[PDB]
Amino acid sequence: YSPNTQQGRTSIVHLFEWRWVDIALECERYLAPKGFGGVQVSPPNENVAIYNPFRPWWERYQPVSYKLCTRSGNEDEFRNMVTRCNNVGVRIYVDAVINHMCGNAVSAGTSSTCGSYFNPGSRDFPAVPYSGWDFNDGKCKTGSGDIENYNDATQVRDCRLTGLLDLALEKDYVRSKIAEYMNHLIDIGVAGFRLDASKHMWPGDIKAILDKLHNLNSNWFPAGSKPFIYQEVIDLGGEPIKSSDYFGNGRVTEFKYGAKLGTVIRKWNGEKMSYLKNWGEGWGFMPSDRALVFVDNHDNQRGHGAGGASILTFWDARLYKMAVGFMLAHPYGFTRVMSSYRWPRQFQNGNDVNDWVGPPNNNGVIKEVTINPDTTCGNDWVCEHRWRQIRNMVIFRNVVDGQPFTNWYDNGSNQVAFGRGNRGFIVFNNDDWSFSLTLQTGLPAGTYCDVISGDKINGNCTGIKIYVSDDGKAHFSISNSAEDPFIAIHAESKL
Numbered sequence: 478y479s480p481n482t483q484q485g486r487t488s489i490v491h492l493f494e495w496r497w498v499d500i501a502l503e504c505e506r507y508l509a510p511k512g513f514g515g516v517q518v519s520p521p522n523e524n525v526a527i528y529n530p531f532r533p534w535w536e537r538y539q540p541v542s543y544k545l546c547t548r549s550g551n552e553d554e555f556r557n558m559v560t561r562c563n564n565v566g567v568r569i570y571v572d573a574v575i576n577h578m579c580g581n582a583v584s585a586g587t588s589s590t591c592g593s594y595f596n597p598g599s600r601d602f603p604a605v606p607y608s609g610w611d612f613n614d615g616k617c618k619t620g621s622g623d624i625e626n627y628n629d630a631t632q633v634r635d636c637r638l639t640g641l642l643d644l645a646l647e648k649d650y651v652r653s654k655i656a657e658y659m660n661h662l663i664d665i666g667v668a669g670f671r672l673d674a675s676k677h678m679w680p681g682d683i684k685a686i687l688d689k690l691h692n693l694n695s696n697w698f699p700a701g702s703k704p705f706i707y708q709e710v711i712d713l714g715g716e717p718i719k720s721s722d723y724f725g726n727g728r729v730t731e732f733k734y735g736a737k738l739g740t741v742i743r744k745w746n747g748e749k750m751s752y753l754k755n756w757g758e759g760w761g762f763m764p765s766d767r768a769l770v771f772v773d774n775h776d777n778q779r780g781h782g783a784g785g786a787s788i789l790t791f792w793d794a795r796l797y798k799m800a801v802g803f804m805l806a807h808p809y810g811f812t813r814v815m816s817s818y819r820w821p822r823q824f825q826n827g828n829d830v831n832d833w834v835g836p837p838n839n840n841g842v843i844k845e846v847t848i849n850p851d852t853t854c855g856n857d858w859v860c861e862h863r864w865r866q867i868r869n870m871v872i873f874r875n876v877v878d879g880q881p882f883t884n885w886y887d888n889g890s891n892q893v894a895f896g897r898g899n900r901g902f903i904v905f906n907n908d909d910w911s912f913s914l915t916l917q918t919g920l921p922a923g924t925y926c927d928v929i930s931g932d933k934i935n936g937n938c939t940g941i942k943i944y945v946s947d948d949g950k951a952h953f954s955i956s957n958s959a960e961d962p963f964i965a966i967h968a969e970s971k972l
């Protein structure tokens with residue numbers, strides 16, 4: 478349940494579709510000095526090379542083998558990345574696609590990221606190797622062989638998720654091949670895993686696989702360390718499968734988090750920020766120490782997965798930064814920040830016809846992440862984790878780690894504020910009028926740099942300054958027209 482991050486680092490960032498060499502550099506030049514705890518990487522195992530449409534991001538969720546050979550790089554580049562990141566105190570978490578192999582309708586051949594041969598039709602994946610009896614064909618009871626009804630917990634686990642060949646995870650052979658892959662990664666140095674499509678695997682089968690795993694690499698982790706496990710389970714209620722069924726294996730993705738926060742920030746369905754006073758289990762969420770929270774993820778930012786019209790993404794930058802800021806300031810769960818790439822989003826009758834578009838590329842070859850002079854990224858990589866407003870809140874979370882949620886204030890509408898012990902304080906104005914008020918910050922007297930509008934740089938503030946008096950009170954004035962309608966100050970932004 479522990480992320481295994483360096484003490485003091487409290488977040489992980491999803492560098493979606495980034496190449497290993499770029500992540501390695503990012504760890505050294507940015508993530509380590511800015512206090513990021515780790516990186517969730519895209520699936521590092523060989524996948525199907527899909528040509529229609531042209532190299533979609535989702536081809537990486539169709540395994541062909543467990544060779545560490547993808548568009549992100551080969552095994553040496555992967556090992557190089559893990560070593561360099563661990564050496565600067567930044568962890569690597571692998572997106573483990575272990576529930577299935579490729580789509581059952583994919584043509585047999587060598588159209589894979591490492592050239593390995595595979596034949597979906599005959600259930601032949603010799604690079605593993607897996608054959609017909611390693612899949613759930615005879616186990617599934619639906620007429621199509623695919624999952625047709627989520628109200629039936631059994632078929633959700635034994636049938637094919639959108640046609641993806643379903644591995645027979647009850648078999649010790651299959652469990653062992655998966656463990657072999659995961660242990661290869663653990664020994665290289667990874668700190669944990671995102672277990673993809675966990676809802677589609679029996680909790681008991683996952684347990685059997687995790688039981689075969691090694692302790693983390695003893696060069697970087699204390700003896701007896703166990704990999705951090707966060708399971709992707711979309712549980713919004715209304716289905717028989719519950720997130721709690723997976724608590725014995727590790728943490729679980731709390732999809733209710735971003736769905737509701739999005740609704741609240743958009744001020745939809747009668748919701749408002751003043752209601753966030755009891756944010757957390759009070760809102761029906763799972764226990765804090767079992768939750769992996771996020772505003773958006775790689776699926777729902779593009780309408781995939783549970784989707785949801787309320788989800789906030791970089792496309793709605795202003796509200797997004799506020800949502801991410803609230804998340805990073807609030808003690809609930811372990812936080813994951815999304816880092817995306819831009820694609821030509823085009824809605825036709827409510828559906829984005831380009832929701833498949835893969836990462837920036839030159840005829841299939843992923844583009845490097847270039848860093849602009851102002852520290853933003855080029856080549857259409859959004860790099861939300863480099864946005865000052867988000868990066869500074871990442872450190873805010875580190876600075877206030879362990880401090881209690883306190884000094885809450887709300888105007889009965891959308892102007893709220895709260896502190897974390899005596900280490901940090903944050904103020905939000907999401908109402909259609911100015912927030913002008915003197916509030917108890919719980920902080921020591923002094924001059925604090927607002928880390929949303931600027932930074933503290935050698936004795937100065939490059940943005941707004943907040944003055945906390947002897948009684949801990951400070952005046953805040955945030956116009957509803959502000960491009961960033963929130964202010965945050967903490968122990969380390971004090972002059």
Ligand SMILES: OC[C@H]1O[C@H](O[C@H]2[C@H](O)[C@@H](O)[C@@H](O[C@H]3[C@H](O)[C@@H](O)[C@@H](O)O[C@@H]3CO)O[C@@H]2CO)[C@H](O)[C@@H](O)[C@@H]1O
Binds near residue numbers: 648
């Ligand atoms: O020997 C030729 C044969 O090699 C490969 O077969 C593998 C199977 O595909 C794979 O399932 C596994 O078989 C094991 C069963 O899963 C397990 O239940 C139990 O019966 O032990 C079996 C042997 O370990 O391993 C075999 C051997 O690697 C390849 O996939 C076949 O196409 C090929 O004919």
Ligand SMILES: OC[C@H]1O[C@H](O[C@H]2[C@H](O)[C@@H](O)[C@@H](O)O[C@@H]2CO)[C@H](O)[C@@H](O)[C@@H]1O
Binds near residue numbers: 647680681682
């Ligand atoms: O826990 C792992 C195990 O779960 C399932 O077992 C089923 C069983 O097959 C059914 O007959 C009935 O007893 O419900 C059980 C689950 O409560 C999977 O079927 C099995 O493959 C898997 O290993």
Ligand SMILES: OC[C@H]1O[C@@H](O)[C@H](O)[C@@H](O)[C@@H]1O
Binds near residue numbers: 795865
């Ligand atoms: O590229 C970085 C920038 O992206 C923007 O569109 C966000 O709204 C900015 O606040 C951020 O500084």
Ligand SMILES: *C(=O)[C@@H]1CCC(=O)N1
Binds near residue numbers: 706725726727
């Ligand atoms: C938590 O993520 C890991 C897996 C379960 C455990 O005991 N440690």
Ligand SMILES: [Ca+2]
Binds near residue numbers: 634643644677678
């Ligand atoms: Ca399954």
Ligand SMILES: [Cl-]
Binds near residue numbers: 709730774
């Ligand atoms: Cl996820």
